Ligand binder design. Structure first.
Ligand SMILES: NC1CCN(Cc2ccc(CNC(=O)c3csc4nc[nH]c(=O)c34)cc2)CC1
Ligand SMILES: NC1CCN(Cc2ccc(CNC(=O)c3csc4nc[nH]c(=O)c34)cc2)CC1
Lengths: 206, 206
């Protein structure tokens, strides 16, 4: 797989060079590229942002600088991923289907976001997905991109109940006797019950 | 605020030293500490994991090594955050209330997770929260911790419709005329409509 990440903060994607994402690149399975958006600016200040039309707080990421960036990087086979709090939610279903792609481009937005037309224009030649990682507000799209990339890369290099290891008794807390029984069907029966219960208390919607 | 992050991958928390999270530490508003869990191991191999009781795939993070780590770092006033796919969902409501804390500890889990007793024992002296960032599977809790910390740190240093900046016309795509009208009540009326519509198409549950 080929992954290109476009951002004003390349260093924010350095965890992708560590642990399993790093093992995926070193195995030669994934080719990761992280680009500074400012490499496509031609002004003396390397401005990527500007004042929003219709006013409002914050700044808006310039469409022509992004347009130039994505014009060189993308092709008609590219899946352009635009992380945004306005997108559809990222799930494991999304991670699983992204493993069937040869080229993923992550257009990481800063300030108030990216000029909407970048997405409309890109959709003329390639598929585009606007995706949120959850119901919370982040200052940028780089942390979201790390999350999405390691979840895809986890499958590439191929509610949960509680886990216990040695010792059997620790600080007055004993490992449930059932996990020391040797009855594999009984162990499975318990794990289902505890998971089902944990699911009702924390995520009844699931 | 004081933030301590315990992990087997300290480098995975380096984006917190960049952008706004970095501005929060440099402003002296937040004191960030990232610890290697292996600094609390006494064996020759610095083993943090071991085989699970009742069997099953993968390894389980040892409770005594974590117990020793959290014993030194935490106090009775500490809010211990255990990122896990078994936790309650992280939202903006959670980020907003975490801004009222003086000490947050992030116990980042690897392998199949942390021995459940670490959480049960810690809950004897301090408050504990098991939290998931979404309906997807990650190889570790460090990316989740970056997400949660920048969302809290964003508020500390204090669906959305589309955004547009200069030029008015780009690649045959014009900025909606309404944003060039000068009628602030009309601009607000439109922004509500487009957001409400985007919300119905992507997040009707919201
Ligand atoms: N007081 C208001 C709060 C919301 N602001 C909008 C806004 C704009 C840009 C962002 C940046 N978001 C991301 O890059 C992002 C990218 S993926 C993602 N998933 C969940 N939440 C997220 O914030 C993100 C967040 C919020 C406007 C001012
Ligand atoms: N084939 C099975 C797939 C699930 N595995 C369980 C498992 C254990 C540990 C993790 C690690 N998760 C996190 O550290 C985590 C921490 S916060 C979070 N939020 C959403 N999703 C997440 O995975 C996380 C993920 C899945 C068992 C094998």
């Amino acid at each position: 797989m080929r992954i290109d990440i476009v951002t004003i903060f390349p260093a924010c994607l350095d965890p992708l060079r560590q642990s399993l994402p790093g093992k995926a690149i070193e195995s030669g399975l994934v080719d990761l590229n992280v680009h500074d958006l400012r490499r496509w600016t031609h002004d003396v200040h390397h401005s990527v942002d500007d004042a929003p039309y219709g006013g409002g707080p914050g700044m808006v990421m310039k469409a022509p600088v992004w347009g130039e960036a994505l014009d060189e990087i993308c092709s008609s086979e590219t899946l352009l991923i635009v992380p945004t709090p306005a997108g559809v939610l990222f799930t494991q279903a999304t991670a699983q289907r992204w493993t069937t792609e040869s080229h993923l481009v992550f257009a990481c937005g800063r300030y108030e976001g990216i000029d909407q037309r970048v997405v409309q224009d890109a959709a003329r030649r390639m598929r585009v997905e606007e995706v949120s990682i959850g119901d919370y507000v982040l200052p940028g799209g780089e942390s979201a991109a790390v999350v999405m990339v390691e979840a895809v890369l986890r499958l590439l290099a191929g509610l949960e109940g509680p886990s216990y290891t040695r010792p059997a008794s620790w600080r007055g807390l004993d490992v449930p006797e059932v996990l020391l029984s040797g009855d594999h069907a009984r162990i499975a029966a318990w794990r289902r019950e505890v998971s089902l219960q944990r699911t009702r208390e924390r995520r009844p919607d699931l």
